[PDB]
C-alpha cells in the first residue's frame, strides 16, 4: 500500500516548522488556507516540506514548493510522491 499523509500528519508537520517557540502559527485548521495567510513564508514552508521529505524519503522541487498555495495542494504533492516512495 502507498502510505499517504492525512490532514493530521500534515498538521503536525506544519506544527514542526512552527515549533521554534515564537508564535504567529497556525495550530489546528489550515489545510484550505494559503500558506501566506497562515504565516508561512518561503523558509517556514520549506521547513515543513523538508521535515516530511527527508522522513519519508522524497524530494520536492523548490519551484513547486512555491507553486503550492494551499496545504491541501501541498499534501497532494507529497502524497503523489509517496505513492512512488518507500
Swiss-Prot record:
Residues 4-82 form the Carrier domain. The keyword Amino-acid biosynthesis does not apply. It comes from the Bacteria. Keywords: Antibiotic biosynthesis, Phosphopantetheine, Phosphoprotein. Disulfide bonds: none annotated. SUPFAM superfamilies: ACP-like (SSF47336). The modification O-(pantetheine 4'-phosphoryl)serine is found at residue 42. One of its GO terms (cellular component) is membrane. One of its GO terms (biological process) is antibiotic biosynthetic process. Pathway: Antibiotic biosynthesis; actinorhodin biosynthesis. PROSITE patterns: CARRIER (PS50075), PHOSPHOPANTETHEINE (PS00012). InterPro entries: ACP-like_sf, PP-bd_ACP, Ppantetheine_attach_site. Acyl carrier protein. This is Actinorhodin polyketide synthase acyl carrier protein.
